[PDB]
Design a protein around this nucleic acid. Sequence first.
RNA 1: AAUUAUUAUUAUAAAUAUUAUUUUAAAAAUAUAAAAAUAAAUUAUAAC
Lengths: 85, 79, 214, 72, 80, 113, 203
Amino acid sequence: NACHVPGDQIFLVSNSFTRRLLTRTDHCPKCDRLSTFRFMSVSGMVGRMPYKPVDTPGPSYATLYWRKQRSGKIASQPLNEVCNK
Amino acid sequence: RFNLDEAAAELQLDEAYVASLYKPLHYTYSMKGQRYPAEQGRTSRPGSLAASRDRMFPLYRRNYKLNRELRVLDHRRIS
Amino acid sequence: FQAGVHTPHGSRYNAARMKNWPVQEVPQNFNFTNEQRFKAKAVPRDTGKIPRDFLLSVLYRNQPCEVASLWEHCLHDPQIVLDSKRHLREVLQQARAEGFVSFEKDAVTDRWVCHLTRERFEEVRALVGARAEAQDLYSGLRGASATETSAYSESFREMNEDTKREHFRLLSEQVADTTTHLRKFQRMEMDYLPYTDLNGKVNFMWWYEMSDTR
Amino acid sequence: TAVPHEEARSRPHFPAYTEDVDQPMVVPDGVCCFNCDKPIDGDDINSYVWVPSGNARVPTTQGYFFHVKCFK
Amino acid sequence: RHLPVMPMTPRVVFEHAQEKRIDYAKKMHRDRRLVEQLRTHEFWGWYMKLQRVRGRWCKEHGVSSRGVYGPAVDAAELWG
Amino acid sequence: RSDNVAMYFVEYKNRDMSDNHKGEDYTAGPERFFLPPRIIETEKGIQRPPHMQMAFDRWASKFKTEEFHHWWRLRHAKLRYWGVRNVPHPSDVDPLWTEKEEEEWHNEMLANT
Amino acid sequence: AAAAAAAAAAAAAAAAAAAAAAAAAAAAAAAAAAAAAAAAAAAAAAAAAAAAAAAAAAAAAAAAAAAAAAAAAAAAAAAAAAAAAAAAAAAAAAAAAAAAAAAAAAAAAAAAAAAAAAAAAAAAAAAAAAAAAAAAAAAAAAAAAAAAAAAAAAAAAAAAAAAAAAAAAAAAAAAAAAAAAAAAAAAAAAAAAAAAAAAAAAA
RNA sequence: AAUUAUUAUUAUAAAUAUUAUUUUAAAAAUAUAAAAAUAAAUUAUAAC
């Protein structure tokens, strides 16, 4: 969704927060920086759509391709943990 | 707090250049733009004193010097 | 975390407990409804700089590491910054996009094996070293004489020549079994406060301290 | 792309800022001005032009790089 | 024979000035992006101090910023 | 008066056990809108939170510069051109925040230094 | 205007409505807007000899029919990376840079192709001459690494048994540098004994 | 363009400044604009 050189992160679309949509500086996941993340992928809506169910926004295609690749491998870390605590 | 002047020492430009970037480009240079006709200043009434938009907005005065170095080249640079 | 909310009663770890959080005694016959466990949302754990380096420290002592030894090693430290086996799974998802860990499985076996990536292993030694630069110096009995270290200063070179793992059969448990007596003497408290960064996202700020429980 | 049978974009034939997470498109660490051989700043300056082609030539992402006064 | 000098024909003094207003129009657009960082960078730097003076003031006054409920509700590993 | 719209005065109820407005008063506003507002005279040296001022002192000290004054006066020129009556000429316009004027607020200014 | 009007503004909207002209910004609504607004300058097409280097190689591998639309397919197959700066038109820039400078002439049979290489098949021989046997040399210089990258483990096959025998070196002290403040004196001495009960008999 | 009005007067140069004008507590017609049906973008719709 928002990606720069170091790491990645997940955000959302608080309609007040638009001037951060394209390029929001952020503390990078890696060691340290106030990296200037850009906008990579849509990830759906904050509030619902009038008389439209919660699934009408839709995150993105590549965002599905993201968590299925960023997280993705729950079969690779079913060690020490599964969906439970 | 962030201070432009104490910042320009990190950029070495000057005081009067960092500011011109953070106010419209008719308050420093010689481009086209109209201020507001109340800011133009008045005469001296029987009651009130005089005014002048160099005594009312000393910061908004055109920096005709800084225009010399940046946007207009000399005649002794191309001789 | 509680006695038997999500995992049946008897699943307690000798780990860094959270501050102020009591062991709320859940009665024995209690059970969830399978449709109550539907949502089952829980508290997000701190996966930051303190746990990561800590996570690497135990992955740095063991460049390969397997399933259970992933958590079975965190018990072998003076200071731990985990509370559960899910707090171990949590940071690992972080440490992958940190390029710190690219763990795999050996084809001849059928277990998943840790490995600090070689695109970052040379530098993470400083990160485990910046923890280590005062990890040895702050020790107390080290600095009380010389005959305790001098009764051992010569073994480190003669161990790994002809008695290498001979000592490692003890260097795992006996040198760490006292930390279990110490885990009952000094845990760490994952004191936390929630907040929001100016982008708006929610996150916490964790003030880690050792519990002087005694 | 091999979008199944010419199922690409209708009005512009291309969308804006299609999700770039697949390839990070990061500037190199070792770099050179393709014509003047000058090291180039990473990502906070406009004084370098990236030429990201389908192919890859110059540095490590290998889209060409000039200095803004080195393209002549 | 002397070194070559193409005179200042009105065209070449027209390009010599173009070459100047460009870098100026670039320099502005350059260090419009330089103090921009020093402002944003110092903002968050000031802010991370704010959440930390806020923090170690709450840890001293019982203000847990967590809801009316006690800590036991967060111990449950449930939202509820 | 601009549009005959009835003005309501919404407010939060319990403000005695509050933290940051434990003893504030809202009969009329402060002297210049960037000061800590009036307080109930029984609680003068009452300790407000130490951070809800760091977002105030950081803020109430942008209206103290000469450039803001050149905004405050310019804003009049904008208005009389924009037709708003009753806006006195930008010539005779008192500055918002001066130096000597501040000492009166520098009176109760001996908390931490 | 429904997308703008509906209260909860979506995510697509916030990215669509943006037509700003700052760096790394919405390019469509920067393109869509006025020609006085766009600084969307000309697409830097590479006509490098490098673009000749991934040209004279391929044809001598497959010089048949229809090499003008599925020629880019080769560019989508033969991929260390493609060749066309813009697959769309740079691959159509490939023949004109080839047709000019007297390098490649077309071939037309039921359709137009890029065959016959235009009498420069000698400079295609000594192009591939500078290919495999250039790729051959550089992949073994990293094998010089990989003749000692075996040793990279081997130089620390002992050290990872050594400096994990150093990982106790401090802990053994710190195991008892905290025992000091709990005072076993029996589990304390033996934990220092059972270590030194076999430490001096080693070597 | 009668104006402090439908308006980037743009020959040129350009790219991460939140750089500073838009009232109202009701109802219809109209005006813009809008979930569902007789592989595509369309309908008509004088429907929320």
